[PDB]
Amino acid sequence: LLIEAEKVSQSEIWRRRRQEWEIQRNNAEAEMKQIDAQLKSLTVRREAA
């Protein structure tokens, strides 16, 4: 039973690790869309200049 407890605990910390990976991926994609919209702002400023 202790062996089986260690196995299921290792699987659970793998799942929590994967969830943290997914949160990092979503932050990276959000920053990428942010920088594209800021590029649109900058080319508008270029047209004004």
Binding site: V44, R45, E47, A48
Partner: protein, 48 residues
């Protein structure tokens, strides 16, 4: 002599008229240039 002083009165009047019309033409030119400049500043405000 009376004829000559009459003529010099005409000369003074003509000098004043010439300087006055040059001032007026310069004024109209300044106004048209102001019109073009305000068009450009409108476009810049749109981009803002």
């Amino acid at each position: 002599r009376s004829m000559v002083t009459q003529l010099i009165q005409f000369g003074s009047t003509l000098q004043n008229i010439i300087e006055r019309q040059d001032a007026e033409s310069l004024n109209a030119l300044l106004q048209n240039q102001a019109k073009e400049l305000i068009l450009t500043t409108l476009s810049i405000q749109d981009k803002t």
